[PDB]
Structures are given as C-alpha cells and as structure tokens.
Design a protein around this ligand. Structure first.
Ligand code: NI
Length: 341
C-alpha cells in the first residue's frame, strides 16, 4: 500500500506511486523523472493517466511501451489545469526530463514536490518567486553537513583535462565511461567533444539517448564501436576484469584504457579535493571515481529551504529509520531559527 508522503491531500493525485497496484481514489498519477525507484510498476498494461514532462513521456512510450493514450506530457514553466486543479512543472536540475511539481489546492494551500533535485540559486527566479508555499515535499538524500562535493562544472573540467592529457601522450589509449541509468550525460559528452570523437555504445543505450531531446545528438553518438574512441559500458563492468575483457574485443586498436566511474558522494570527499584525485591502476588500465552529483549538497539544500521559508517540510528520502528522521527534523529547526521564519 501507498505511503502518506506520496499522496497529495485534497486531490485525486499521487507522485511516484506505481508499485502499489490501484491506489484508492487516484484519478491522475504524476511521475517526476525516469529513474527506476520512481517508475517502479509502470508497463504496457498500465491504464490510468500519467502526467510528466515531454522527455519522460518519450521514455515511457519507447522504453516501457506504455500506450500513448495514457501519456499526458506537460510543458514547463506553464500554468496547466489537471482534473480541475492548477499545476506547474519546473526543471529539477536532476537528470533529463526531471521535474518539480507545484500544486495550487482548491482550498488556497500551495504544495511544492521537488522530486529528486539539485538545488540552485537560479530557482529563486523561477515562478517560485511569486508566492508562498505551505508544504514542501523535499529530496533529503544528502541532508547532513558531512555531505560536500564540488560543482558539476569543476568535476567536468577535471575529467576533460585528464582525458585530453592521457590521449595526447598516448594516441592509442581508449576512454571508457560507466552508466546504469539516465543522468550525468555531460561526463561522456564533454570528454568525446574534446577528443573529436563520437561516443560509441550498445543499441539499447543509443535508444535511451535518442528519447532525450539533446540538440544535435546524431552528431554526438553512434552504435559503430570501431569508429569511436570513447565507449560507454554498463557500470558493473567498470573494473579491472571487465575492462581487460573489453580491450580484448577491440582488435589490437588500443594498448591502454582510461575509465571513469561517476558516483554520488563517497567518504574520500571528506579528505581529498577534486584537484588531488588519483586513480586505481593495474597494468595498462586506470579507473577514476569522480563525484558528479545530481542531488543537492547539504549547503545547497539549506540555502534553498531558507529562501523558500515553507511552513512545513515532509522529507521523501532517508525516511525509514528513527535516527534519520530525528536528525533531519533537528536540521530543519536550526534552519528555521537561524533565518527567523
Ligand atoms: Ni533520481
């Protein structure tokens, strides 16, 4: 059965609630983004209205075969009426297609559901500027001060310079980048662009990227592995064994691999600056772990919430333990006393 923090009071609506069967009195199911924990349950057999972005709609149709009659895409930054209630979708700065949802309740209450998001000062100049929010349903993935990481721009700078240096020293090196879902596409796109190559991948991954409305995509990716010196592989294969095995298949074109594993936060963030990061190396294979986050740092989260000044906060991540829930409630009270709302 569907938990409370996925229901929107005073509406027939749920958010990211497809794994519970038929939800009593749900007339429209919202999906914030195409990540498996959130879409869990959708398929070609689903027969209720799904509301989402255009990009999420492309993935539902082509990857999950959801029938077209039940896909309701909405434009961003635009007031829309759904089942007699005003809603707006806003960019979440998460993965492609990810939204936040503003609901304007018939009784005068305003609710923001962040989905998964990476808070940014640019959100203080969206349609959120205009008015009050009474309840915030918040992506609390990294709600603790130990969670620090650099900007996406610094991480990409590090990856481009690392790849360009290595391939200029050795023109016979191959670059490999891990993936297991959408998001983080800038890692492999920026590397390929500096190297003057398309990105090679499987047919299944090429299909997924074709759903994402990335400009000039046909100029950036390919299924012809032989033509490309930046390859994508599933994340589970980014290890000394998997990469040895991959190099065998390239037909003596390459004598070295340099690989990247994007992660979220890891404990080596607690000591080592992005500049100072070093790889793990065995023979002619080197693997860099790089902390490319699509969720708010503690400081970014705190900034956003202090600016918005919500009356109540409902966390949507780390809700399963008493210690987690208690820790989060203490931070929300400090933020409120410090800023005076
Ligand atoms: Ni996500």
């Amino acid at each position: 059965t569907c938990p409370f923090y996925k229901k929107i009071p005073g509406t027939g609506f749920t958010v990211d609630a497809f794994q519970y069967g038929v939800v009593e009195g749900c007339t429209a199911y919202f999906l914030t983004h195409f990540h498996s924990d959130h879409y869990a349950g959708l398929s070609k057999h689903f027969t209720f209205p799904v509301y989402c972005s255009e990009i999420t709609g492309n993935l539902l149709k082509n990857k999950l075969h959801v029938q077209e009659q039940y896909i309701h895409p909405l434009p961003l930054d635009t007031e829309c009426i759904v089942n007699g209630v005003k809603v707006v979708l806003l960019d979440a700065n998460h993965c492609p297609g990810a939204v936040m949802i503003l609901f304007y309740l018939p009784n005068g209450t305003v609710i923001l559901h962040t989905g998964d998001f990476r808070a940014d000062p640019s959100m203080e100049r969206s349609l959120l500027a205009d008015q009050k929010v009474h309840m915030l349903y918040l992506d609390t993935t990294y709600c603790s001060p130990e969670y620090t990481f650099p900007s996406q721009q610094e991480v990409i700078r590090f990856a481009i310079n690392t790849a360009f240096e290595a391939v200029t020293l050795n023109p016979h090196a191959l670059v490999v980048c891990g993936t297991y879902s959408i998001g983080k596409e800038k890692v492999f796109l920026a590397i390929a662009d500096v190297l003057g190559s398309k990105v090679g991948m499987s047919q299944e991954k090429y299909k997924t990227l074709q759903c994402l409305n990335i400009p000039e995509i046909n100029s950036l990716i390919t299924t012809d592995m032989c033509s490309s010196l930046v390859h994508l592989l599933p994340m589970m294969q980014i290890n000394f064994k998997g990469l040895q095995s991959h190099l065998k298949k390239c037909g003596g074109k390459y004598n070295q691999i340099l690989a990247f594993r994007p992660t979220g936060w890891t404990h080596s963030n607690k000591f080592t600056r992005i500049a100072d990061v070093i790889p793990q190396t065995k023979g002619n294979i080197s693997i860099y772990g790089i902390p490319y986050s699509e969720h708010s740092s503690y400081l970014e989260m705190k900034r956003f919430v202090q600016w918005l000044k919500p009356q109540k906060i409902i966390p949507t991540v780390n809700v399963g333990t008493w210690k987690s829930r208690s820790t989060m409630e203490k931070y929300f009270r400090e933020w409120k006393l410090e800023a005076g709302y």
